[PDB]
From a paper:
The dedicator of cytokinesis (DOCK)/engulfment and cell motility (ELMO) complex serves as a guanine nucleotide exchange factor (GEF) for the GTPase Rac. RhoG, another GTPase, activates the ELMO-DOCK-Rac pathway during engulfment and migration. The DOCK-A (DOCK1/2/5) and DOCK-B (DOCK3/4) subfamilies specifically activate Rac and have an Src homology domain at their N-terminus; the Src homology domain is involved in autoinhibition and binding to engulfment and cell motility (ELMO) scaffold proteins. ELMO is structurally divided into two domains: an N-terminal domain (NTD), consisting of the Ras-binding (RBD), ELMO inhibitory (EID), and ELMO domains, and a C-terminal domain (CTD), consisting of the Pleckstrin homology (PH) domain and proline-rich region.
We next analyzed a DOCK5FL/ELMO1FL sample crosslinked with bis(sulfosuccinimidyl)suberate (BS3), a widely used N-hydroxysuccinimide ester-based crosslinking agent, achieving a reconstruction at improved resolution (5.8 Å) that clearly showed the ELMO1NTD density with two-fold symmetry. To enhance local resolution, we symmetrically expanded and refined the particles, focusing on a single DOCK5/ELMO1 protomer and the dimerization component, which led to structure determination at 4.8 Å resolution. Model building and refinement of the DOCK5FL/ELMO1FL complex were completed, with the exception of the C-terminal region of DOCK5 (residues 1643−1870), which remained disordered. The structure of DOCK5/ELMO1 showed a closed conformation similar to that reported for DOCK2/ELMO1 (21). Despite the common closed conformation, a detailed structural comparison revealed that DOCK5/ELMO1 is more compact than DOCK2/ELMO1, with the two ELMO1 NTDs located closer to each other. A closer interaction was observed for DOCK5 than for DOCK2 at the ELMO1RBD-DHR-2 interface, between Glu36 and Asp39 in ELMO1 and His1545 in DOCK5. The C2 domain of DOCK5 interacted with the ELMO domain of ELMO1 in the apo state of DOCK5/ELMO1.
Numbering used by the authors:
A (entry chain B): 819 to 1368
B (entry chain A): 240 to 727
C (entry chain B): 1 to 269
Write the structure that this text describes.
């Protein structure tokens, strides 16, 4: 009840004197006592006579900052969290009201003693049990209420370069934690986009500070862009045209009140990367993967602005394809396109605009452009194949057409010798046949997969593995596993000659390569059983009908 | 329990009815009602469709055990019944009737008849027992009022003295209310009717008492007095008012409560709005269309919304329900289904064991209907398979569950449904399947609201304004055909 | 078609009824359409429909309906009671979106919650109508506004639709980047309204004793309604009616009586 008098005390007293008197009082609390209650006291204070800011701000906010900073890490503060959040809430709420006077510097101080502080605090509050949203609020309010002037003033101007880089570690990792697994129930579209707005602005400011202090001029210690670009992309990867579509005006809503963030985010990305200059070669195999999800956003503008970035990175790699090629880009490029476009996110006009831009790039530069031209043809083919594939996939359910198209693209990949997605679709096929309950053809697919593998005791490649199960896996272990289910299929396929043949080679491989005689016996006695089935069982003869298409 | 209860039904099938009452008394002395209540009326496993049949048929057993004693006529010359009603309306009218007319004269009896039936709406007081010769129900109305005089005496005498103030046409005839209500509720229940094996809906709210329908009638006659005072209706519309009221009581019954107390709640709940609520909620369409502007535009909306209705029925049928196989009373699986292919040019149908998951998508037993070739829907009786019914094999309600689309150009796809709204569903589904007009009562039932919704949302711009049918005069377009500021 | 004079006043109008298809961009358009009449002319004004701000039509002033409206709630005063024009205009917008979504709530054969949507829809149109009858005093409008926000957020919840803000006078007026903390406060208190609303819907969904408890627990100023019609008895003298209150338990009485001169034959003196 002591603060409950201050508003009328001021009316008959020196407000500064009252303020410092309360300061002298409260500062004297033995820290082992009555924490949350003294915080409530500070709240009841900060509500009132802080409207009379211009005289008591400079003498309380120091003190209040001190108490909160002490509250920062006392290792038992879990109930203190809610109360301290109330304090931050109320101080910022009063500081942002427009009838308070010049407060920029006082913010600046609150900033200077609590930014990384509450940032670390929420970095502790990562468990989704407490009132996370309160501190997330206080965070965003701190960083939007403040000004770029303040960052540049001293937040950019903290202590030693290594320390500030560690601080940046902290900020970017915790952001990337924020963009994923939003702490708000996603129903708070207002609040969610506000948070996106403020985070975007903060990231802009950090873009300037990175540019300022971490170019080739600071040739040293230049990895952070990993974290940066990853943050940018993960941010960029929601609030997409479907979401704004959900009303005609929903689009118009997010546009009018906010614009479409993606454009400026991508623009910052692209010119950040341009300014990166002579070191992009350190990024291609990594960062090609991210930049497609921006490349593939259903809009037109930033897509048109973005497409050239692939060309820029590949021709920079041409500066390193003076020795060799740029394949050590296009391989993973293609791979990423495969995953994403099969995910269901491409467009045909995407490839059209692609064609236009890539052709611009080719018809600018010399002979490497001819190479890139034929590779652009490869990319085209790739696209329209995936496009037709997808458009058929989820509509007819005609397993015949599904098999037909997937094997079309499998054949194409075979021609383009991309064994990896080859295998991917081969396993898609085994599942497709399983759901069709067709066994001979499923076995046949399994074979043509297996026949890539050889009988060398060297586990040459893990890339050939599907990512389901792997330990050391000398190739023969996988080959014999494959054969186990293959012969299982040929059994349940009720066709045997190929089965007994595969038994022949599996048996010889056992006997003269691994000497696992139990397996020898098992498979050979099963082969004998298959022989007797051949004789005893009946074989119906399927009839062959010729089907023209016209 | 299905087996044993159906055996009990069998004991009730071909026994002399007096020995039906003897064995009914045996059941009551064991109180089979309550023991069945605690065991299987508390069973929460897959309660048999044969339980559906058993509950219905046991209700019918009770019902006919009342029927065989009610169809006969209580003679209006029964001096025994003269004494019976004498003491009954003693304990009823003993507030207007002295306790002395127990020792009194038949002359005071006739005077009490005339006064208490000019206050309870009877036209004759020299032969008062004339209204006792129409069964439904006859005597059981007197049994009703007996048992009410035994138990509900407070509200009983309250009825007796509350009818004692209105001598205009707002007076309610307890005798005539009783006869009317009892016979027509008998008809709504179809009390004591022949075995209908397709009746799989039942009345647990009366599996919980022995005089359940008696006390039901009294609680609903308090409902009656409430309803009379709801409209303040005269006795000229006595038949009109109470027919409407029992329409509402049918609504309350059809809400299907499974407890007596919940239906008492419903006796409270049915407001005078319910008397008019939906029966006039079908009319907002016609007030909308009485003026042209709603009327004159709506006629282009239907293809959108009729398409919606038909295609919604289609989407229902794509999964589809499981019909019943004809006369599989000899322990054959009745619930056969028919799947509507997402292609909708073929059907997938057959009979299996009961599937609480609905239909199992599989290439069914016989798996075809050429939608193009198959043409004619024999809507109900027109099925040649059941065209031979006389009146006993099929009656005039199964064809509202049964019909066929032809098939093979020779044979019928005989149909059955658990109920009739989904009969409407399947009908208009197959109906749309040919590009031909919708013939479900629910179709013309639900266009209104959805059409009403579209028009009301379309008129969100036209509030507190007036328009006539006559359009305003039309100015002319001058020949400066390009803009100052061009398009876009 | 030339001679185009613009003014922001006209950018928002509607039509009287169906049009005619005499010319090309003059087709028999719909009855009520907020159209973009950007520019004005002698005989026919421009029009860019709600459904396409770019689709063209030169419609006549005569067939412009009673709407020269604008985004200005002040000018024509066909925005009769400004400030509540917001609430009603987003009221209309949300009703349109509700109708759209439940239109495809058929295969969501949720006829239960579908029909509650229709109930809320009728309730909403009649509520808005009463608001358009804005002759009412201020407290009624306040309480109506509060329960309107309630029903809107209700629907958006079960419909899986976004939350609105700004408890008072507009449901939206926050976006002004007023205060992220105030924004959080509004969001949290409204969300609490949301879960408490779901649980009070389940409360009021089966039995309705708790509503009696609540309504009789807010304010406790009660009186006893002696809904007397007739006295069923006869004493012969001026029998005098004295009601009163007594606790069977506290062994003490509560209120005081009232004399009623009832007559000597069960009639009133």
């Amino acid at each position: 009840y002591l603060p409950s008098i201050i508003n009328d005390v001021k009316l008959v007293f020196d407000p500064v004197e009252l303020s410092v008197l309360f300061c002298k009082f409260i500062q004297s609390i033995p820290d082992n006592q009555l924490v949350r209650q003294k915080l409530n006291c500070m709240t009841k204070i900060v509500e009132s006579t802080l409207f009379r800011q211009s005289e008591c701000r400079e003498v309380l906010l120091p003190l209040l900052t001190d108490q909160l900073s002490g509250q920062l890490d006392d290792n038992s503060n879990k109930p203190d969290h809610e109360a301290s959040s109330q304090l931050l809430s109320n101080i910022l709420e009063v500081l942002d009201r427009k009838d308070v006077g010049a407060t920029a510097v006082h913010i600046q101080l609150i900033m200077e003693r609590l930014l990384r502080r509450i940032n670390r605090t929420v970095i502790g509050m990562n468990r989704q049990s407490p009132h996370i949203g309160s501190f997330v609020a206080c965070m965003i309010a701190l960083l939007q209420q403040m000004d770029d002037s303040h960052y540049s003033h001293y937040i950019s101007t903290f202590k030693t370069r290594q320390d500030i880089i560690d601080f940046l570690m902290e900020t970017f990792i915790m952001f990337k934690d924020l963009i994923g697994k939003n702490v708000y129930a996603k129903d708070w579209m207002v609040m969610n986009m506000t948070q996106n707005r403020v985070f975007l602005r903060a990231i802009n400011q950090f873009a300037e500070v990175l540019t300022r202090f971490f170019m080739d001029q600071a040739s040293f210690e230049l990895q952070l862009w990993n974290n940066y670009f990853h943050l940018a992309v993960a941010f960029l990867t929601h609030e997409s045209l479907q979401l704004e579509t959900f009303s005609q005006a929903k689009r118009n809503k997010i546009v009018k009140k906010y614009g479409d963030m993606r454009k400026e985010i991508g623009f910052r990305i692209r010119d950040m990367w341009y300014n990166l200059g002579p070191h992009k070669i350190k990024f291609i195999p990594s960062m090609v993967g991210p930049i497609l999800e921006v490349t593939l956003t259903p809009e037109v503008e930033l897509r048109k602005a973005t497409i050239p970035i692939f060309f820029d990175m590949m021709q920079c790699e041409f500066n390193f394809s003076g020795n060799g090629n740029f394949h050590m880009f296009e391989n993973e490029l293609i791979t990423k396109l495969d995953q994403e476009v099969e995910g269901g996110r491409g467009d045909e006009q995407y490839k059209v605009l692609l064609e236009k831009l890539l052709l611009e790039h080719c018809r600018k530069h010399k002979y490497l452009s001819s190479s890139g031209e034929v590779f652009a043809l490869l990319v085209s083919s790739l696209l329209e194949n995936l496009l037709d594939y997808r458009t058929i996939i989820m509509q007819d359910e005609s397993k015949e057409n599904r098999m037909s198209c997937t094997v079309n693209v499998l054949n194409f990949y075979k021609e383009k010798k991309r064994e990896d997605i080859y295998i991917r679709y081969l396993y898609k096929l085994r599942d497709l046949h399983r759901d069709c309950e067709n066994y001979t053809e499923a076995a046949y697919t399994l074979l043509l997969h297996a026949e890539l593998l050889q009988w060398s005791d060297k586990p040459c490649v893990p890339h050939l593995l599907q990512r389901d199960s792997y330990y050391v896996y000398t190739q023969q272990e996988l080959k014999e596993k494959l054969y186990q289910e293959i012969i299982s299929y040929f059994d349940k396929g009720k066709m045997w000659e190929k089965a007994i043949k595969l038994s022949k080679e599996l048996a010889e491989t056992y006997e003269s390569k691994v000497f696992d005689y139990e397996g020898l016996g098992n498979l050979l006695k099963k082969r004998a059983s298959f022989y007797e089935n051949i004789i005893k069982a009946m074989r119906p003869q399927p009839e062959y009908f010729a089907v023209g298409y016209y | 329990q299905t087996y044993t209860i159906a055996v009990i039904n069998a004991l009730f099938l071909k026994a002399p009815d007096e020995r039906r009452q003897e064995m009914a008394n045996i059941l009551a002395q064991k109180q089979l009602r309550s023991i069945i209540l605690t065991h299987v009326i508390r069973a929460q496993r897959a309660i048999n469709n044969e339980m559906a049949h058993q509950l219905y048929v046991l209700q019918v057993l009770t019902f006919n055990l009342l029927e065989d004693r009610m169809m006969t006529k209580m003679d209006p010359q029964d001096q025994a019944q003269r004494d019976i009603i004498f003491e009954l309306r003693r304990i009823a009218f003993d507030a207007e009737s002295e306790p002395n007319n127990s020792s009194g004269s038949m002359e005071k009896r006739k005077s009490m008849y005339t006064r208490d039936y000019k206050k309870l709406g009877f036209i004759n007081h020299v032969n008062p027992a004339m209204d006792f010769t129409q069964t439904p129900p006859g005597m059981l109305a007197l049994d009703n009022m007996l048992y009410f005089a035994k138990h509900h005496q407070d509200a009983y005498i309250r009825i007796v003295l509350e009818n004692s103030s209105r001598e205009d046409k707002h007076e309610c005839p307890f005798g005539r209310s009783s006869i009317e209500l009892t016979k027509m509720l008998c008809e709504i229940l179809k009390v004591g009717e022949l075995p209908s094996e397709t009746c799989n809906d039942f009345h647990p709210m009366f599996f919980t008492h022995d005089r359940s329908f008696e006390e039901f009638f009294c609680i609903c006659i308090q409902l009656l007095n409430k309803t009379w005072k709801e409209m303040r209706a005269t006795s000229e519309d006595f038949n009109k008012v109470m027919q409407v009221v029992k329409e509402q009581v049918m609504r309350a019954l059809t809400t299907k409560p499974s407890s007596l107390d919940q239906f008492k709640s419903k006796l409270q709940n049915l407001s005078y709005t319910e008397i008019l609520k939906i029966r006039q909620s079908e009319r907002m369409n016609q007030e909308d269309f009485q003026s042209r502007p709603i009327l004159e535009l709506k006629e282009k909306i239907q293809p959108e919304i009729l398409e919606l209705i038909k295609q919604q029925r289609l989407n229902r049928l794509v999964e589809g329900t499981c019909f019943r196989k004809l006369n599989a009373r000899r322990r054959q699986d009745k619930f056969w289904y028919c799947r509507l292919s997402p292609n909708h040019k073929v059907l997938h149908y057959g009979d299996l064991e009961e599937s609480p998951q609905g239909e199992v998508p599989h290439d069914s037993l016989q798996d075809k209907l050429p939608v193009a070739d198959i043409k004619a829907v024999v809507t109900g009786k027109d099925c040649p398979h059941m065209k031979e019914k006389g009146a006993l094999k099929q009656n005039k309600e199964v064809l509202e569950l049964a019909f066929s689309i032809l098939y093979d150009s020779n044979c019928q796809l005989n149909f059955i449904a658990p109920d009739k709204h989904e009969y409407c569903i399947w009908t208009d589904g197959l109906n749309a399947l040919l590009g031909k007009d919708m013939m479900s009562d629910l179709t013309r039932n639900d266009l209104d609201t959805l059409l009403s919704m579209e028009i009301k949302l379309r008129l969100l711009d036209l509030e507190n304004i007036q328009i006539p049918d006559a359009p305003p005069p039309i100015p002319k377009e001058p020949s400066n055909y390009d803009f100052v500021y061009d398009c876009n | 078609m030339a001679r185009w004079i613009p003014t922001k006043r006209q950018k928002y109008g509607v039509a009287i009824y169906n049009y005619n298809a005499s010319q090309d961009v003059e087709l028999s358009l719909q009855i009520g359409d907020t159209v973009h009449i950007l520019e004005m002319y002698e005989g026919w004004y421009r029009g860019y429909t709600l459904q396409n701000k770019s689709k063209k039509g030169i419609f006549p002033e005569t067939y412009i309906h009673l709407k020269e409206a604008t985004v200005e709630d002040l000018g024509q005063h066909e925005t009769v009671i400004p400030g509540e024009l917001p609430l009603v205009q987003e009221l209309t917008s949300t009703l349109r979106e509700w109708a759209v979504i439940w239109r495809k709530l058929y295969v969501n054969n949720k006829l239960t919650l579908f029909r509650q949507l229709q109930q809320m829809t009728y309730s909403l149109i009649e509520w808005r109508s009463q608001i358009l009858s804005g002759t009412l005093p201020k407290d009624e409008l306040a309480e109506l506004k509060k329960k309107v926000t309630a029903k809107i957020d209700h629907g958006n919840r079960m419909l899986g639709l976004d939350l609105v803000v700004r408890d008072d006078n507009g449901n939206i007026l926050d976006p002004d980047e007023t205060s992220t903390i105030a924004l959080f406060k509004a969001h949290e208190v409204a969300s609490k309204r949301i879960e408490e609303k779901i649980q009070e819907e389940k409360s009021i969904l089966q039995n309705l004793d708790l509503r009696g408890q609540s309504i009789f627990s807010t304010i406790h100023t009660y009186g006893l309604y002696v809904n007397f019609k007739n006295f069923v008895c006869n004493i012969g003298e001026d029998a005098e009616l004295f009601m009163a209150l007594y606790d069977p338990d506290q062994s003490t009485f509560i209120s005081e009586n009232y004399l009623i001169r009832w007559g000597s034959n069960g009639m009133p003196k």
